[PDB]
């Protein structure tokens, strides 16, 4: 209540001591920050002639300046000064400028100079920071008869495409094929040898990424944990087909489109990051897990104990790869899958025994054996 | 599927059949040491 | 020339404005920071009765606190406020730890949260930040059958250690017992003679600290003052049970394994801060206060007029019962309790009257009479009620005197040796129980001593 307010004034308002009048609703969040051994952060923001403290950090602001407090020790030592156990760092509420300035001004030169000779991975971290701030700096600094035709033609196609969320998974499985064809056709040598590369790739990148966001949202609305798996399986398979089909046609057709219809500088090369590929695999793993479980369910009298118990054991494991998944912490899921394979095994062992008896009982009848 | 088992050592354990990790606790009065009272009759209150 | 010095004072020294006396040798580096379009940084550190400003960043010190100034613009605009174009960031004297926490806490959630679903090129920034924080975490945290044994035993229980949020109070109790057994096995030196004493002591400290914080985390959320006393005391006592058991078991069993599993110079020593012990005391205080109020309500006809007035004052007291009981600030509640205790006393005397009748109404059966005294623990411990009903408890003591004499006579009357052993054991249990209860209920009354 001394350092917290003093720093707030020093950065936001008058560079002086705030009167000892802790009669604000924000005093609770301050007291939580200090006393609660879990609250390692506290945000402060200057309001309209007001001060607002909150443990929650939010980024709805456009280009405002905020300051966040950071704790060193589990709990504050009240007897000691409130500036000997807490760090401060300011930051702008700008998704581009804040990262650019923060990294460029603080982190890049800090790592370059402030490095211990005995610590590794420093040269890699340095390269990462350089590439990062470079990309941000680029973004931070940012006959009409043919031009009109191009705008009207591709704007029409784009607007027809943009109504994508209105389509179900079972329908977009076919749209991926139609969209790839029509977009590659319109790029052809119609009114000009070749339209500037800018849109030539940008539109396809939007369309590909749009399918990604589309499938990510639509698979979430299936509730890939509830009882009506019958309908989920149908829609899920469609989601995979969307993801894989687009990637396949992109990689194949691009090779010939840029050689036959539009004299584009790129030849026998692809463009698409293939983020759908990872999303498709994600759903495939889910389908395989759910399918195996249903197969065990048919044998429920054989592995009753395993099936019932493991269902709830594996639920917190699945929670490591939620709906609308993005593989930016993928190692966490890898750990979940490793445990899945090691814990489900008793089920496989008991069923393996049953299957051996049930199959070997077949008196070498090729028909029954195959089935 | 749930059941309890008593032993001569003066304790009663809990368990079940399907999910064997629901609440693997034991029952004990507010006592210390052992008190091997050799429990010999167990029943259940026939109500909700 | 205002912000640089004023901020230094606010963080390092006195929380006040420095007099306008820029007559220090360090003023040159400060002036360079302001005027030089190249010097985008300036570190400040408080030395022994000194302040040192320099763009140079160093980590020669061990655990000091420093601050570095950063500009947004190449040059300071003196016309504009001198605190609207300069940012600061503090750090500890660790070139790796500072970067790890700063990046993880700031950038990782910044990009992930502050993102439009339709905006591209962010996937690259995401991957960069992921590798960035990963490499920082990796370095910060940095035959084989020995290490593998340790890891297998650790992971057996580390899964929950690192994911306790998903458990509940009952599971925590089980975890306390479970964990002790698992770690005890790690002291075994049969897979490999090597045993890393320092690793076990460090790990136990880490587990104790984090686990303790967890327990109080869950307890804090209960809001243990609501009307459903039944649920309050149930969950409350669970927290106490966790606290007491964990402290007792960890300290006792640790002191044992140091000499039993590994014949180390250590034995019978404490290795835990016992934060849960303090928590348990706080929980007991909340129970006592919440309970004694409920007891007043149970006996409400005795002093109804007082309970009404006491409730109205009890409420603003209860408002001073926070959670996350930081021992540094606990006097706030203690003062509230003191005032609470002072004002409820007239009701306690009226209750003592009702209790005198309540006990008198009970048939002369030592069991039910004793149970009534043992049941109403909070009320008996009241100085008023204790004095007022001392004669009845003294009578029950005389009954206990008879009880042991009866047991004595059965004793004096005492293969078949097994049954004798069982019988005398039963006598020990009965007599021991009596003296233990009597001590508590008679409040060490001289009659008890005999």
From Swiss-Prot, chain B:
It is found in: Cell projection, Cilium; Cytoplasm, Cytoskeleton, Microtubule organizing center, Centrosome. It comes from the Eukaryota. Expressed in chondrocytes (at protein level). Intermediate chain of the cytoplasmic dynein complex 2, a multisubunit complex, composed at least of eleven different proteins. The cytoplasmic dynein 2 complex consists of two catalytic heavy chains (HCs) and a number of non-catalytic subunits presented by intermediate chains (ICs), light intermediate chains (LICs) and light chains (LCs). It is linked to Short-rib thoracic dysplasia 8 with or without polydactyly: A form of short-rib thoracic dysplasia, a group of autosomal recessive ciliopathies that are characterized by a constricted thoracic cage, short ribs, shortened tubular bones, and a 'trident' appearance of the acetabular roof. Polydactyly is variably present. Non-skeletal involvement can include cleft lip/palate as well as anomalies of major organs such as the brain, eye, heart, kidneys, liver, pancreas, intestines, and genitalia. Acts as one of several non-catalytic accessory components of the cytoplasmic dynein 2 complex (dynein-2 complex), a motor protein complex that drives the movement of cargos along microtubules within cilia and flagella in concert with the intraflagellar transport (IFT) system. DYNC2I1 plays a major role in retrograde ciliary protein trafficking in cilia and flagella. Also requires to maintain a functional transition zone. Belongs to the dynein light intermediate chain family. This is Cytoplasmic dynein 2 intermediate chain 1. The lineage of its organism: Eukaryota, Metazoa, Chordata, Craniata, Vertebrata. The gene is DYNC2I1.
């Amino acid at each position: 209540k001394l350092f917290i307010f003093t720093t707030t004034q020093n950065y936001f308002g008058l560079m002086s001591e705030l009167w000892d009048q802790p009669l604000l609703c924000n005093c609770l969040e301050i007291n939580n920050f200090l006393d609660d051994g879990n609250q390692m952060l506290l945000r402060v923001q200057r309001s309209d002639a007001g001060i607002s403290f909150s443990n929650t950090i939010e980024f709805g602001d456009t280009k405002d300046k905020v300051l966040v407090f950071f704790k060193l020790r589990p709990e504050v030592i009240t007897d000691e000064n409130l500036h000997d156990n807490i760090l401060v760092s300011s930051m702008l509420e700008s998704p581009i400028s804040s990262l650019y300035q923060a990294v460029r001004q603080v982190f890049a030169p800090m790592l370059l100079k402030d490095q211990e000779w005995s610590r590794n991975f420093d040269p890699k971290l340095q390269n990462l920071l350089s590439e990062l701030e470079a990309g941000l700096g680029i973004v931070l600094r940012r006959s009409k008869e043919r031009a009109n035709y191009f705008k009207e033609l591709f704007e029409t196609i784009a607007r027809e495409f943009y109504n994508l969320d209105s389509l179900s998974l079972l329908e977009v499985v076919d749209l991926v094929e139609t969209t790839q064809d029509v977009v590659d056709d319109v790029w052809r040598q119609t009114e000009h040898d070749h339209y500037p590369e800018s849109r030539m790739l940008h539109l396809l990148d939007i369309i590909g990424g749009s399918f990604g966001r589309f499938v990510q949202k639509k698979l979430g609305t299936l509730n890939l944990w509830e009882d009506p798996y019958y309908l989920v399986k149908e829609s899920l398979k469609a989601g995979i087909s969307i993801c894989e089909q687009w990637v396949i046609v992109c990689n194949h057709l691009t090779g010939q489109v840029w050689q036959r219809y539009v004299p584009h500088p790129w030849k026998n090369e692809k463009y698409f990051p293939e983020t759908l590929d990872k999303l498709g695999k994600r759903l495939e793993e889910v389908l395989a897990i759910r399918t195996i479980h249903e197969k065990f369910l048919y044998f429920l009298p054989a592995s009753e104990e395993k099936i019932i118990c493991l269902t709830r054991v594996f639920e917190p494991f699945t929670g490591l790869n939620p709906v609308q998944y993005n593989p930016y912490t993928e190692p966490l899921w890898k750990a979940a899958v490793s445990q899945y394979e090691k814990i489900i095994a008793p089920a496989e062992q008991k069923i393996a025994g049953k299957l051996k008896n049930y199959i070997s009982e077949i008196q070498d009848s090729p028909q029954q054996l195959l089935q | 599927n749930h059941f309890i088992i008593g032993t001569d050592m003066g304790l009663i354990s809990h368990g079940t059949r399907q999910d064997l990790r629901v609440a693997p606790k034991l029952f004990k009065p507010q006592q210390h040491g052992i008190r091997p009272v050799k429990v010999n009759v167990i029943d259940f209150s026939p109500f909700g | 020339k205002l912000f640089i010095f004023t901020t230094t004072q606010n963080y390092f020294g006195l929380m006040s404005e420095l007099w306008d006396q820029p007559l220090l040798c360090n003023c040159l580096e400060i002036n360079n920071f302001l005027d030089d379009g190249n010097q985008m940084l300036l570190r400040v550190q408080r030395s022994d009765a000194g302040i040192s400003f320099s763009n140079t960043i160093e980590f020669g010190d061990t655990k000091d606190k420093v601050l570095v100034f950063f500009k947004l613009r190449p040059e300071v605009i003196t016309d504009e406020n001198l605190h609207d174009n300069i940012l600061v960031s503090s750090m500890l004297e660790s070139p790796i730890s500072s970067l790890y926490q700063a990046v993880r806490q700031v950038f990782a959630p910044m990009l992930l949260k502050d993102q439009e679903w339709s905006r591209n090129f962010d996937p690259k920034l995401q991957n960069l930040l992921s590798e960035l924080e990963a490499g920082l975490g990796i370095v910060l945290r940095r035959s084989k059958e020995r290490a593998n044994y340790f890891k297998e035993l650790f992971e057996t229980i580390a899964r929950e250690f690192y994911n306790l949020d998903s458990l509940s109070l009952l599971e925590v109790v089980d975890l306390v017992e479970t964990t002790q057994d698992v770690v005890d096995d790690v002291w075994r030196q049969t897979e490999h003679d090597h045993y890393p004493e320092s690793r076990m002591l460090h790990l136990l400290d880490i587990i104790g600290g984090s686990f303790g914080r967890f327990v109080q985390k869950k307890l804090g959320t209960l809001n243990l003052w609501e009307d459903p006393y039944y649920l309050v005391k149930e969950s409350l006592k669970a927290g106490i049970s966790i606290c007491e058991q964990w402290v007792i078991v960890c300290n006792h069993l640790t002191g044992q394994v140091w000499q039993r599993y590994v014949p180390h110079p250590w034995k019978n020593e404490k290795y835990f801060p016992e934060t849960l012990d303090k928590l348990g005391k706080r929980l007991e205080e909340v129970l006592a206060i919440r309970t004694i109020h409920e007891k007043f309500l149970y006996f409400l006809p005795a002093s109804e007029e007082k309970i009404i007035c006491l409730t109205r004052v009890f409420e603003p007291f209860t408002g001073l019962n926070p959670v996350q009981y930081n021992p540094y600030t606990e006097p706030l509640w203690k003062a509230a309790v003191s005032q609470y205790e002072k004002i409820i006393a007239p009701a306690e005397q009226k209750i003592a009257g009702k209790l005198k009748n309540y006990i008198s109404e009970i048939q002369d059966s030592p069991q039910q009479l004793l149970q009534a005294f043992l049941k109403y623990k909070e009320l008996v411990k009241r100085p008023t009620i204790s004095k007022e009903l001392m004669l009845e408890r003294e009578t029950l003591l005389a009954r206990l005197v008879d009880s042991i004499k009866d047991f004595r006579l059965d004793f004096e009357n005492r293969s078949e040796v097994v049954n004798s052993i069982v019988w005398v054991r039963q006598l020990e249990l009965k007599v021991d129980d009596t003296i233990k209860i009597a001590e508590a209920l008679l409040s060490d009354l001289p009659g008890f001593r005999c």
